[PDB]
């Protein structure tokens, strides 16, 4: 019933300008692959993971 409050971390997304898709008669290839390597992660910079 009562409204709930908590402190949360801001989250942001980053993408390459790589856009792929499927359509009937489209000129795009159907299978794609990429990798992401993690260099540094602080498990708890704040009270939230």
């Amino acid at each position: 019933l009562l409204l709930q409050t908590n402190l949360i971390n801001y989250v942001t997304s980053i993408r390459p300008n790589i856009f792929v898709g499927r359509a009937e008669g489209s000129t795009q290839y159907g299978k794609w692959y990429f990798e992401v390597m993690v260099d540094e992660v602080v498990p708890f910079l704040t009270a939230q993971a």
């Binding site: 498990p43 708890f44 704040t46 009270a47 939230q48 993971a49």
Partner: protein, 107 residues
Amino acid sequence: GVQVETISPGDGRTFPKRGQTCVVHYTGMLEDGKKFDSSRDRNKPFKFMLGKQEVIRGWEEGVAQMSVGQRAKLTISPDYAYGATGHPGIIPPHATLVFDVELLKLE
């Protein structure tokens, strides 16, 4: 009634023993996902000694299976927890508790 899932592996050798203080950081949630406790919002690690039954059973059995530096998720059955009574105003009766525990150090 304790189920331990690893999140980040520990050293894998050192384990808590009876009569040894465990310094942990935890975040308690009810199984539906509502947070009810966390020692990180207080910026103070939680200390307790194994064997003295100062905490619920699930913590005593659950942390004993953990290693130093390990981050693990504990799913505590209500009967291994506050059970039918339940912490009034905090934890409802017959509630399964989910914890995100990290064994910082043994002292």
